[PDB]
């Protein structure tokens, strides 16, 4: 990477000003004579003792144990930016009451307790408590900074050859937070860095500014493609989360200190708007954040299959040869991807007339194989009077503008290009309408979309993005909105795929740039990684950092985007990717073809094995994403989320869990002969899903591996559903029978869920057409019941097999289900592995039933 292209904090004038303020006595104080206590908000004026600038603090207790702090100017010359469209609703409030007051402090109770807020008058300070336990402090180190708007590098500012006219001057806002008892903080993607966020004292702050970083490097705090301003704090005793709702460029300082962590946010414009999410558990934090910004959109089942991509597939015949290659080499694949060379000279929504002359016929051939296609659509529009999209957006004034009122023009893939103003709701409605089958000619229901370069990437712009003083809808500057520009592209595209179907089909959109709330619109991936072993390792902490802040549909390019991976590295990457949410192989224009059947037979077999495991686990993945969609719980989880009191897990990032059932430790070293697997949990057991060997936790197990090994363990007390009939695509499988894998706890119990629907529509929510089954084992009986009775589904899916790990040999097996006579099932039992196989239950998955082991 060329770092001189990108500002350090020192080269950013507002970051340099803010960060030069070091901990000390704050000049802000609250004017308690001005205090007014309302139902939804407490308001009180703040004053800077020197400048005499007056601010207004809006403090709100919210339902679900959350507090919201908003600070704005009292008398602003011009309104400051307040981030729209991120919050899914106006958060329900809780009442504040005065429970104590002196000359310098006012104690506030949220509803009837036990959460309290202490407002200190001078110096201004906020403390949050549950009973008498101090949870969090605000401005305890006196780092609050609010640059008020003066008369229109503090003003006119240059970086390299780009001049920011900065018509409003310094407007930055900042605030610090103290976390007593916390030593581990996580989140604020996106950064190519460790899961546990490092202290920034001796170096750069973490930067949140959606940027296109060419050949980005590992273990550094440079800003990457997306920004989610959410930090989570975890200790043995509690879990906390901070949501800094600001869309401008933001820097985050982290310092350690009886153990305590301090967090400081520094943003270029906008108001101070922060949510404090008090837990107490990390799942309480997940729900709290989900209530503000929504939950992960339910992916259509196919998008959880395997995606085969590269820059670029030559033409229709190449795409069909790839399709046939998968079938001729017995490898499953759901989606083949068309990168930017499929269009006419990077004019999006078009097709190259020589290499893709009949896109509908190509989509019809793939539909006959029950496979999908994804086409890239970027938000830069070639300046071209022969280009219908550009003419419509220009004639309707839907482009981002410069200060002189002309449409902004930068340089990107098609050369000179303009940028639609996606903050304009009319522009997003226009975009969504362009995805109708009449407007996007050549598209069909099995064509889906990839939004790339939506930071936005501008090749000749400062830091390869849009100028700060470009002007958006309502007159707001680009510096005010930057970090939600990509989100708006993701949103308008996802809406377009829903509207083209008349509101029935669920969308699939991949996006590179993202913000808080992007989980509502589809998937993201970690951009342009490299075919190196360290980039394989870092896919885990990067997608885990996204999982913790709501973005569960995450992945990294399998094999690496840049460069050519050695065959062993490509195999280890398929095994890694097979157990990550978004599963796509992608490659640079100048890389060699690496479709999985082009390798030697030994590497093909291990890659096929990995693909079979992924497709077999689709019912399990589908259920985890339904739980993420309904509850806000991440699919891919750090070990500390399931074991919050095992402090040896607080930093683990070579290991991860899927739900609470599967612990994954992929091999990520060339020529490795074993891995150190930490199996956590007191009174916990784990089953090696390959050998069925049972292991007692806690321990660090050395497990020998070969090229075909994917170290995966099932937790005792869980039931994992699988489709053991692997076909060529998920559409082929979605009516196939289920096999239930029961891993018995030491108490002889297990439980799990299974979600089913049609796989691609919203009928599950508009018609309640779905199944949510609960499977439970206790005593010697396995019982299927409804976990949500409002869901009914016409489906031929049945239970073809039950596998029980940790069971003794029964004398007889008896199945009962209503409407049927009592049935006897034959079985098989391995005494060495204590595995019990129940042959062909044969019961509908929609029916209640129970299997007893006599």
């Amino acid at each position: 990477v060329d770092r001189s292209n990108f500002k350090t904090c020192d080269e950013s004038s507002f970051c340099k000003r803010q960060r030069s303020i070091r901990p000390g006595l704050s000049p802000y104080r609250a004017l308690l004579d001005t205090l007014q206590l309302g139902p939804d908000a407490l308001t009180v004026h703040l004053i800077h003792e020197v400048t005499k600038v007056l601010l207004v603090l809006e403090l709100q207790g919210l339902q679900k144990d959350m507090t919201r702090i908003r600070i704005d100017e009292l008398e602003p010359r011009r309104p400051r930016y307040r981030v729209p469209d991120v919050l899914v609703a106006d958060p329900p409030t809780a009442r504040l009451s005065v429970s104590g007051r002196d000359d310098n402090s006012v104690e506030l109770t949220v509803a009837e307790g036990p959460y309290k807020i202490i407002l200190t008058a001078q110096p201004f300070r906020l403390d949050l408590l549950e009973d008498r336990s101090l949870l969090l402090s605000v401005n305890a180190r006196g780092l609050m900074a609010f640059e008020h708007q003066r008369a229109p590098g503090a003003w006119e500012e240059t970086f390299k050859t780009h001049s920011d006219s900065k018509p409003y001057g310094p407007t930055s806002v900042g605030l610090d937070f103290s976390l007593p008892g916390m030593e581990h903080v996580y989140g604020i993607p996106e950064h190519a860095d460790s899961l546990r966020l490092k202290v920034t004292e001796g170096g750069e702050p973490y930067r949140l500014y959606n940027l296109d970083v060419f050949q980005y490097e590992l273990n550094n705090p440079m800003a990457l493609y997306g920004s989610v301003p959410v930090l989570l704090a975890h200790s043995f005793h509690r879990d906390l989360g901070i949501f800094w709702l600001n869309a401008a460029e933001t820097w985050v300082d982290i310092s350690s200190n009886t153990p305590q962590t301090d967090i400081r946010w520094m943003s270029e414009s906008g108001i101070i708007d922060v949510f404090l999410m008090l837990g107490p558990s990390v799942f309480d934090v997940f729900r709290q954040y989900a209530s503000l910004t929504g939950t992960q959109a339910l992916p259509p089942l196919f998008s959880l299959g395997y995606h085969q991509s590269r820059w670029n597939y030559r033409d229709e015949a190449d795409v069909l040869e790839v399709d046939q290659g998968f079938d001729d080499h017995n490898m499953p694949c759901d989606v083949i991807w068309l990168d930017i060379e499929h269009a006419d000279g990077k004019r999006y929504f078009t097709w190259d007339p020589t290499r893709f002359p009949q896109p509908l016929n190509m989509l019809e051939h793939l539909a006959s194989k029950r496979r999908k296609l994804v086409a890239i659509v970027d938000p830069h529009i070639k300046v071209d009077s022969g280009y219908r999209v550009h003419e419509e957006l220009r004639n309707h004034g839907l482009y981002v503008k410069t200060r002189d009122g002309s449409d902004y023009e930068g340089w990107c893939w098609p050369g000179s290009a303009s940028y639609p103003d996606f903050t304009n709701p009319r522009m997003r409605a226009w975009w969504s309408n362009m995805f109708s089958f009449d407007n996007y000619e050549g598209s069909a229901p099995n064509l889906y979309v990839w939004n790339d370069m939506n930071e936005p990437s501008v090749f000749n712009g400062p830091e390869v993005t849009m100028l700060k003083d470009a002007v958006h809808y309502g007159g707001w500057e680009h510096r005010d909105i930057h970090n939600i520009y990509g989100l708006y592209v993701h949103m308008a595209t996802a809406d377009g795929l829903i509207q083209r179907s008349g509101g029935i089909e669920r969308p699939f959109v991949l996006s590179r740039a993202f913000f808080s709330g992007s989980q509502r619109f589809g998937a993201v991936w970690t951009g342009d990684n490299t075919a190196e072993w360290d980039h394989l390792k870092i896919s885990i902490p990067m997608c885990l950092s996204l999982a913790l802040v709501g973005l569960s549909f995450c992945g990294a390019d399998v094999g690496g985007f840049f460069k050519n991976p050695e065959p062993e590295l490509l195999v280890r990457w398929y095994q890694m990717g097979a157990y990550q949410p978004f599963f796509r192989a992608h490659a640079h224009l100048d890389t060699g073809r690496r479709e999985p059947w082009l390798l030697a037979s030994q590497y093909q077999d291990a890659i096929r094995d990995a693909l079979f495991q992924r497709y077999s686990l689709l019912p399990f993945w589908y259920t985890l994403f339904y739980q993420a969609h309904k509850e806000g719980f991440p699919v891919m989880r750090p070990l500390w989320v399931q074991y919050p009191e095992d402090m040896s897990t607080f930093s683990i990032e070579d290991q991860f869990m899927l739900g609470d059932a599967l612990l994954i430790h992929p091999v990520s070293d060339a020529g490795a002969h074993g891995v150190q697997v930490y199996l956590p949990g007191q009174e916990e057991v784990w089953y090696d899903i390959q050998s069925y060997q049972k292991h007692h936790g806690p321990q660090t197990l050395y497990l020998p591996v070969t090229l075909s090994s994917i170290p995966v363990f099932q937790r005792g007390g869980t039931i994992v559903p699988r489709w053991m009939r692997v076909r060529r695509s998920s559409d082929c499988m979605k009516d196939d029978p289920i096999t239930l894998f029961v891993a018995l706890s030491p108490q002889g119990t297990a439980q799990g869920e299974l979600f089913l629907d049609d796989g691609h529509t919203f009928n599950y929510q508009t018609r309640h057409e779905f199944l949510l089954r609960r499977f439970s084992f206790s005593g010697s009986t396995l019982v299927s019941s409804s976990a949500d009775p409002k869901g009914h589904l016409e489906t031929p899916i049945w239970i073809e097999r039950v596998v029980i790990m940790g069971a003794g040999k029964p004398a007889a097996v008896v199945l009962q289900t209503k409407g049927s006579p009592e049935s006897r099932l034959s079985f098989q039992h391995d005494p060495e592995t204590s595995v019990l196989i129940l042959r062909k239950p044969g019961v509908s998955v929609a029916s209640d039933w129970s299997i007893h082991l006599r």
Partner: protein, 83 residues
Amino acid sequence: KPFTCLDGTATIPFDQVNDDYCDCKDGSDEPGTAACPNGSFHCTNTGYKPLYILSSRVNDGVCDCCDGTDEYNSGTVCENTCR
């Protein structure tokens, strides 16, 4: 008379032949279904050459045999294209 797996692994009653559950390690008990992972389905394909296909492609919704016999209970109606 019961059925014998062609690898001799077991003996099952003929009601467990094509009963949509894999009982033989070689897949020989399910020549007409998608139950076995290692099984094969024979397209008789009169008018063309008869070919074998994977059992995983029986009733997958995809027309594999030119005579269409591999799709008999999937909702996909396959035409004869052996010509």
